[PDB]
Ligand binder design. Structure first.
Ligand SMILES: *CCC(=O)Nc1cccc(Nc2nc(Nc3ccc(N4CCN(C(C)=O)CC4)cc3OC)ncc2C(F)(F)F)c1
Length: 271
């Protein structure tokens, strides 16, 4: 019960920061109960889910989210129950890493890119450690606190209560299996996205075709900046054998290592 119940009046909505299928997000401010502190927040207002069954499901996931406490996982500050369900999130000033990489390709240096993989993999392991399957992981579901500090957006479990085929493990596509190991495959696609400075994985190829492509042993291409210790880690995540895949603990070490000598593993444009 680490989940704060917020009063509609404790916060104000400044601007719409987009709207998805799940809900609508706003840049806003929140003045906590009996405090003269003004926190910048993101307010995830939820869609058509007013059924008593659904609201109990929402709340139950809201407590789960509210107990996920890790530096690289976006924190849930509280919930506001009124006419609509509002999820008061920590504001991420630089938007999503995908947009950010597509907007900084030139100035994004090897040392940052490698430290983002450690950061993502760190947050991911926390979920595998809490036995929570992310199910979402894409460069679009990683947000930017500071360009040095990224955080993962844990909505995969909530979104469950519009198919991301190109980020999915073959077992997820063909047998609807979601393990912390399918989370490793998605992680591979995400790290490929950052190394390509936000490219479309398998662009122009239809979703239906993707399964057979992967079955024919075909994978995502080698990104120009990538070395061989790098592009290898990527293909180990895309192993048809769900258990041949590296663990999130492994990925942390082989990237933590890699981050100690960046340019050795990434060929940017100096230095
Ligand atoms: C690439 C995927 C993406 O756009 N994710 C995204 C979009 C909007 C809102 C969230 N939630 C969220 N956001 C923040 N901070 C944040 C997010 C996005 C922006 N952008 C969005 C694209 N854009 C537009 C449409 O004008 C430019 C600005 C800016 C911003 O910071 C002020 N923090 C937390 C959340 C959370 F609720 F999801 F936790 C994600």
């Amino acid at each position: 019960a680490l989940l704060r119940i917020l009063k509609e009046t404790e916060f104000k909505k400044i601007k719409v920061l987009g709207s998805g299928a799940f809900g609508t997000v706003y840049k806003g401010l929140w003045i906590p109960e009996g405090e003269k502190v003004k926190i910048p927040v993101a307010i995830k207002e939820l869609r058509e889910a007013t059924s008593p069954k659904a609201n109990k499901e929402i709340l139950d996931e809201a407590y789960v989210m509210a107990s996920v406490d890790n530096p690289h996982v976006c924190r849930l500050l509280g919930i506001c129950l009124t006419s609509t369900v509002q999820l008061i999130m920590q504001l991420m000033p630089f938007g999503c890493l995908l947009d950010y990489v597509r907007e900084h390709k030139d100035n994004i240096g090897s040392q940052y890119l490698l430290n983002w993989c450690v950061q993502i993999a760190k947050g991911m392991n926390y979920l595998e450690d809490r036995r929570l399957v992310h199910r979402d992981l894409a460069a679009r579901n990683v947000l930017v606190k500071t360009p040095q500090h990224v955080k993962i957006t844990d909505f995969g479990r909530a979104k469950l209560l519009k198919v991301p085929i190109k980020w999915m493990a073959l077992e997820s596509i063909l047998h609807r299996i979601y393990t912390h190991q399918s989370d490793v495959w998605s992680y591979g696609v995400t790290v490929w996205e950052l190394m390509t400075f936000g490219s479309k994985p398998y662009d122009g190829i239809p979703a239906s075709e993707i399964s057979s492509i992967l079955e024919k042993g075909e994978r995502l291409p080698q990104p120009p900046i990538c070395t061989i210790d790098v592009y290898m880690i990527m293909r180990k995540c895309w192993m048809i054998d769900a258990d041949s895949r590296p663990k999130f603990r492994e990925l942390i070490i082989e990237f933590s290592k890699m981050a100690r000598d960046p340019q050795r593993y990434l060929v940017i444009q100096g230095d």
